[PDB]
């Protein structure tokens, strides 16, 4: 079972990062009853013990989902402690070691990832995802003043955001989904794109400048999809065929 082999590699990387100097504050969940404002500032807590338990629950089918959770440890430290705090440097040292190990094992990891999910090697899936990513970076992120939608809201700067928006979305998360080949057709992609606009209507109001920007993001998305409709339709057909053959 390639999921077992993958999980054993990921656990070995956790063992290696746990062994780096001064990393203990990241080995287990923050005690939010001691660090009393922690959840008022941090939205996605993560630590090496939770990461290991997730590896064992088979939650990570690839390098990328594991690395995204590992990166939360660094991002959380940067937000709570500060970008140059020694704790953030320590957490970064674990992410750096992870990247070294993933690089060392990249061919084996690619093979396991392909055995777990054959669509990651499907040329039509790859071409489709490449087009979506180009739409996001060259058209949607090029909308003037679209910066509020490029990355997840940091609760440190907008403290009530996630009490209002419980199903958040942003363009970086969409790009990560594309990189993970989450989207097999335009429908799921447009579900996430439209969630950005719906959340702006809810949080900012229908007449806010934020919402006008989100509307323009959605509109240039539709326009660019229409320009590539015939290629995208063929790719979606061939992806569906690959998905059915994987049965
Ligand atoms: C992705 C969809 C969310 C859309 N969005 C996003 C924001 C937003 C985002 C960001 C980030 S950050 C730096 N990573 O937090 C880059 C994302 N910074 C700030 C910010 C940070 C400090 N002071 C501020 N003064 C006014 C805004 C502001 N604001 C927002 C603020 C009010 N409404 C909305 C809204 O609807």
Swiss-Prot record:
Phosphorylated by casein kinase II in vitro. Residues 1-247 are annotated as: Interaction with ASF1A and ASF1B. It comes from the Eukaryota. Residues 1-105, 119-228 form the Bromo domain. It is found in: Nucleus. The Bromo domain mediates interaction with histones that have acetylated lysine residues at specific positions. The second domain also recognizes and binds histones that are butyrylated and crotonylated. Component of the TFIID basal transcription factor complex, composed of TATA-box-binding protein TBP, and a number of TBP-associated factors (TAFs), including TAF1, TAF2, TAF3, TAF4, TAF5, TAF6, TAF7, TAF8, TAF9, TAF10, TAF11, TAF12 and TAF13. Interacts with TAF7; the interaction is direct. TAF1, when part of the TFIID complex, interacts with C-terminus of TP53. (Microbial infection) Interacts with SV40 Large T antigen. It is linked to Dystonia 3, torsion, X-linked: An X-linked dystonia-parkinsonism disorder. Dystonia is defined by the presence of sustained involuntary muscle contractions, often leading to abnormal postures. DYT3 is characterized by severe progressive torsion dystonia followed by parkinsonism. It has a well-defined pathology of extensive neuronal loss and mosaic gliosis in the striatum (caudate nucleus and putamen) which appears to resemble that in Huntington disease. The TFIID basal transcription factor complex plays a major role in the initiation of RNA polymerase II (Pol II)-dependent transcription. TFIID recognizes and binds promoters with or without a TATA box via its subunit TBP, a TATA-box-binding protein, and promotes assembly of the pre-initiation complex (PIC). The TFIID complex consists of TBP and TBP-associated factors (TAFs), including TAF1, TAF2, TAF3, TAF4, TAF5, TAF6, TAF7, TAF8, TAF9, TAF10, TAF11, TAF12 and TAF13. TAF1 is the largest component and core scaffold of the TFIID complex, involved in nucleating complex assembly. Belongs to the TAF1 family. This is Transcription initiation factor TFIID subunit 1. It comes from Homo sapiens.
């Amino acid at each position: 079972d390639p999921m077992v082999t993958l999980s054993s590699i990921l656990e070995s990387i956790i063992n290696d990062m746990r062994d780096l100097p001064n990393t203990y504050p990241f080995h287990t969940p923050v005690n939010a009853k001691v660090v009393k404002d922690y959840y008022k500032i941090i939205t996605r807590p993560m630590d090496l013990q939770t990461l290991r338990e997730n590896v064992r629950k088979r939650l990570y089918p690839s390098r990328e989902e594991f690395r995204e959770h590992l990166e939360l440890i660094v991002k959380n430290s940067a937000t709570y402690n500060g970008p140059k705090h020694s704790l953030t440097q320590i957490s970064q040292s674990m992410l750096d070691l992870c990247d070294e190990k993933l690089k060392e094992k990249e061919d084996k990891l690619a093979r396991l990832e392909k055995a777990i999910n054959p669509l990651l090697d499907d040329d039509d899936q790859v071409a489709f995802s490449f087009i979506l990513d180009n739409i996001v970076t060259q058209k949607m992120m090029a909308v003037p003043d679209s910066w509020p939608f490029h990355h997840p809201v940091n609760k440190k700067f907008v403290p009530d955001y996630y009490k209002v928006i419980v199903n958040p979305m942003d363009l970086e998360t969409i790009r990560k989904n594309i990189s993970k080949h989450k989207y097999q057709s335009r429908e799921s992609f447009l579900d996430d794109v439209n969630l950005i606009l719906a959340n702006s209507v809810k949080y900012n109001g229908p007449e806010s400048q934020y919402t006008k920007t989100a509307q323009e993001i959605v509109n240039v998305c539709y326009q660019t999809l229409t320009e590539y409709d015939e290629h995208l339709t063929q790719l979606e057909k061939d992806i569906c065929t690959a998905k059915e053959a994987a049965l």
